[PDB]
Design a protein around this ligand. Structure first.
Ligand SMILES: *NC(=O)CSP(=O)(O)OP(=O)(O)OP(=O)(O)OC[C@H]1O[C@@H](n2cnc3c(N)ncnc32)[C@H](O)[C@@H]1O
Ligand SMILES: [Mg+2]
Lengths: 271, 8
């Protein structure tokens, strides 16, 4: 793994950009190339170094125009650092909440969805489960470029795998029914999450199931409740949204089908 | 709040 195993001193750390459940993110500079990169400093963890690297090797092969590339990892000193390509406009959630809606119009929202579906079709092809698909994990570049990031990150940390609490911790409103029930994930659970992401995009970054307590979500879903069509959301996009939320994962469309659907919508809408 | 605990 010499092509991507780095040393902390290989990168100049700058300001903190933010952080999440896995660690903090900083803007950094890969000295060798005077290249600005994103540096995620993972929390202290117990995961086997061998298991970590094998997982990271898989991620290193994820190469697509709409997936944030893994550039390297610093593993000589635990906790490990994850170096990825720097996205100039931050996460998609904040982007949508602060954007100029006349600029980021219906065609742009469609473009963003198209890009994300392309990236996911690729992950599906690689049988790579993202497990954290959501607007917070979509990053923005120049000219409305959108890239899916932090795919499979959960498999690089043991973290709170085990707790004495009853039940488990989840980003509940993005979690497919079967995942909540069994704490197991698949490409299909990523499809369900993609549906919630579409809703996030359609609403310019609103929090899903507004007014519904997290603890009430599963029951509602079991009884067929689903978020209603967002204001201004095209009927066909909502249709896809609803297909993503089929109770049986088997009944949900594949990302290849979703991407094809969006490419068509994007084409027609281009005119 | 994004995270919450869920007991099946
Ligand atoms: N339980 C969950 O919700 C899982 S997702 P998460 O890790 O808990 O939180 P998340 O919002 O995804 O953020 P993360 O720690 O991944 O930090 C994201 C923030 O840091 C900056 N960031 C991250 N990757 C970046 C790249 N590649 N380029 C520029 N900036 C990046 C962003 O500001 C983002 O909000
Ligand atoms: Mg993230």
């Amino acid at each position: 793994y010499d092509k991507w195993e780095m040393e902390r001193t290989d990168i100049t750390m700058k300001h903190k950009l933010g952080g999440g459940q896995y660690g903090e993110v900083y803007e950094g500079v890969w000295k060798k190339y005077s290249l600005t990169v994103a540096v995620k400093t993972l929390k202290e963890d117990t995961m086997e170094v061998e298991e970590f690297l094998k997982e990271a090797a898989v991620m290193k092969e994820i190469k697509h125009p709409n997936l944030v590339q893994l550039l390297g990892v610093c593993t000589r000193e635990p906790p490990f650092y994850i170096i990825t390509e720097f996205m100039t406009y931050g996460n998609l959630l904040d982007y949508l909440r602060e954007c100029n809606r006349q600029e980021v119009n219906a065609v742009v929202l469609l473009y963003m969805a198209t890009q994300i579906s392309s990236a996911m079709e690729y992950l599906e092809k690689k049988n790579f489960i993202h497990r954290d698909l959501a607007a917070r994990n979509c990053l923005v570049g120049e000219n409305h470029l959108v890239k899916v990031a932090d795919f499979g990150l959960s498999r690089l940390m043991t973290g709170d795998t085990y707790t004495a609490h009853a039940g488990a911790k989840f980003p509940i409103k993005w979690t497919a029914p079967e995942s909540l029930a069994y704490n197991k994930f698949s490409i299909k659970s990523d499809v369900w999450a993609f549906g919630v992401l579409l809703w996030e995009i359609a609403t310019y970054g609103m929090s899903p199931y507004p007014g519904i307590d997290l603890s009430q979500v599963y029951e509602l879903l079991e009884k067929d409740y689903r978020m209603e069509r967002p204001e201004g959301c095209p009927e066909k996009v909502y249709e896809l949204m609803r297909a993503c939320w089929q109770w049986n994962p088997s009944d949900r469309p594949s990302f290849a089908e979703i991407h094809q659907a969006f490419e068509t919508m994007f084409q027609e809408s281009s005119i | 709040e994004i995270f919450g605990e869920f007991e099946a």
